[PDB]
Amino acid sequence: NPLTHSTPKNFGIGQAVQPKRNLSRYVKWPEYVRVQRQKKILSIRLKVPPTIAQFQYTLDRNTAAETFKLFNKYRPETAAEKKERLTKEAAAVAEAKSKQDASPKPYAVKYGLNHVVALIENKKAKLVLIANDVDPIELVVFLPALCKKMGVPYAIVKGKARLGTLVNQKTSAVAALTEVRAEDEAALAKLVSTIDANFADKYDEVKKHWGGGILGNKAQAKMDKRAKNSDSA
């Protein structure tokens, strides 16, 4: 009001320099970004064969949460835990007269790809988690088919990194349980039930369904509005 004045600017072609705006839609990204984006796109413009695309169907955040919860009560030793264990049997046993059996039967999650595979083949695993990342997808593509055949219940889960956490590596590709403390035998069958329902039970039909096909949304609208008017007068 006072000796203050309202001047409003006219930003409308032919006058007033355009103002600063958010051009993030328009920035010229480093070639490497451009690639990792278009790779994701190209991946879905194509029709993707049933044996891939059976991924993409990831476990849901609820069920999963309950699985990382159980799988956590089963981590493998820490370096300290192991250092500590050894000196409790190095010291004992050899002198106390045991059989390297002042150590209890350990119950941990089984991991490492080549490991888990033999487990499945040997019908020893009881719940397998496959990642959904795994860039040479091939490392893992044959796993649903496998588990299916070995009558072993599996689930494809978001997080190779997240698998990694529960086993002390950066990444982990797969994580599996074969063993379980009776205080847990229970709600594992519960977990194997939803999981088998979302994957193994579905597999035979998931196998018949290609993927991809998806248009970009400049092209999607182009024919949601073409195939609107052309039929609907």
């Binding site: 600063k20 705006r21 958010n22 051009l23 993030s24 328009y26 920035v27 010229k28 990204w29 480093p30």
Partner: protein
């Protein structure tokens, strides 16, 4: 939450942290000593007859001087090796690949006197 908000469309290389060198060992074990002290700079006097005259008439001291050395280094070294004050220092390259310095002392000093107390005449 959501995305950044760049107002420019140019993406520039992130300004990232540049650590200074902290070597696990040394360049050369021992620093080189001074490659151009005053004794290497001002080589010997020039005592040609026609050079001598500048000394009697011009209060000027003619020296053969290191090729590697400039008017600053000539000036100071004459100053230091001889306890004298220099006005200005003209130089030239001889046609046998040596450098001649026409050193003019200030008026407090008397190049003649000063030349036969370096020893020549």
């Amino acid at each position: 939450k959501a995305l950044k908000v760049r107002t420019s469309a140019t993406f520039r290389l992130p300004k990232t942290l540049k650590l200074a060198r902290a070597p696990k060992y040394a360049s050369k074990a021992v620093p080189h000593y001074n490659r151009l002290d005053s004794y290497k700079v001002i080589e010997q006097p020039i005592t040609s007859e026609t050079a001598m005259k500048k000394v009697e008439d011009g209060n000027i001291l003619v020296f053969q001087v290191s090729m590697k050395a400039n008017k600053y280094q000539i000036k100071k070294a004459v100053k230091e090796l001889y306890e004298v004050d220099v006005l200005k220092v003209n130089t030239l390259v001889r046609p046998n690949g040596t450098k001649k310095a026409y050193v003019r002392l200030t008026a407090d000093y008397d190049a003649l006197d000063i030349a036969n107390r370096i020893g020549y005449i």
